[PDB]
Design a protein around this ligand. Structure first.
Ligand SMILES: Nc1ncnc2c1ncn2[C@@H]1O[C@H](COP(=O)(O)OP(=O)(O)O)[C@@H](O)[C@H]1O
Ligand SMILES: [Mg+2]
Length: 316
């Protein structure tokens, strides 16, 4: 069994294909705490032991990004994602991801050290209370931005270049890749902002428990921010709707504000692709800004899965 895992620090996205050929996708959050959760009978709990420490899944409080890729929690969050994927517990080969500035050094040269460190991480032994855990055998690592733009790059001429814009949970990374992956023109990593900016704006606009718990509510609002019908039903208060919308827009304006300043650091690209969970949130601005023709602008309605799908297609 081969599973493609885009383990971001906000959400872990899984992709793999079943015997009957159907391609499956799964998403598991990065929500854990350093202690087992006790259940006296009605709550199903996931209690792990990673190295010596016990961990458990739960809708905790939202509080490094980079350090996380080599952390014990990362391993736990991935196993947990496997355990809740529907897949049968088994030995599995995986392909995971490393952020652009972790996978590549300053000269856009792959960083061997980080890569081997990433692989070595899943070498950590994990156990599940009252249950069995998957067994991670082979581990390959792929850079983040590139796999999502590959099938487009194949079609590009060596002189054209795809500008890939990834808006994740806590970072915004942009890269420019030469046609037919014949070279990386530029990488711009910015870990100062992500969708969490908007997320927190919503949790505050509606005095909401700043915890992974309400993240589903915050998400629904962000996603259905243009449909007053949905907003009215999700929000039983009329007054809180105008408020959340104003707070949601200032945060969005900040996102668009930054991606645009950053794009002014890139030049010579002929095609544009927007990916990541928040792709939908900055899509219009960059399309407008770059003024690239419709047939050369790439976006999907499953943006949070563009990377792992691209990884799947490459190494399936
Ligand atoms: N179409 C969308 N519009 C707005 N938010 C989205 C969309 N798809 C996913 N998200 C949200 O963005 C976050 C996931 O973004 P993602 O880039 O996958 O994060 P990660 O940084 O973990 O890789 C989650 O909070 C998720 O609910
Ligand atoms: Mg990501």
């Amino acid at each position: 069994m081969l599973v493609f895992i885009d383990d971001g620090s906000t959400n872990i996205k899984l992709q793999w294909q079943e015997s009957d050929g159907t391609i499956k996708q799964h998403i598991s959050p990065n929500s854990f705490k350093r202690e087992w959760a006790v259940s006296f009978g009605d709550k199903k709990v996931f209690n792990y032991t990673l190295n010596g420490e016990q961990y458990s899944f739960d809708p905790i409080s939202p509080d490094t990004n980079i350090a996380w890729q080599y952390s014990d929690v990362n391993v736990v969050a991935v196993h947990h994602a496997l355990l809740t994927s529907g897949l049968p517990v088994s030995e599995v080969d995986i392909v995971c991801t490393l952020p652009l500035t972790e996978y590549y050094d300053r000269n856009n040269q792959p960083n061997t050290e980080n890569i081997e460190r990433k692989k070595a991480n899943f070498r950590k032994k994990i156990t599940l209370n009252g249950g069995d855990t998957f067994t991670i055998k082979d581990v390959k690592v792929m850079p983040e931005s590139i796999p999502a733009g590959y099938e487009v790059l194949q079609e590009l001429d060596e002189l054209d270049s795809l500008l890939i814009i990834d808006l994740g949970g806590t970072t915004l990374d942009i890269s420019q890749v030469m046609g037919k992956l014949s070279g990386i023109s530029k990488i711009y990593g910015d870990s100062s902002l992500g969708v969490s900016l908007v997320t927190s704006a919503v949790k505050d606009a509606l005095s909401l428990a700043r915890t992974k718990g309400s993240s589903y509510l915050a998400d629904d609002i962000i996603i259905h921010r243009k449909d007053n019908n949905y907003l009215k039903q999700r929000i039983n208060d009329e007054n809180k709707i105008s408020i959340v919308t104003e707070a949601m827009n200032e945060a969005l304006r900040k996102l668009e504000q930054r991606v645009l300043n950053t794009l002014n650091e890139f030049s010579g690209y002929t095609h544009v692709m927007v990916i990541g969970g928040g792709a939908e949130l900055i899509c219009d601005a960059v399309k407008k800004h770059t003024q690239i023709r419709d047939e050369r602008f790439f976006k999907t309605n499953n943006s949070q899965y563009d990377l792992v799908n691209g990884m799947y297609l490459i190494g399936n």
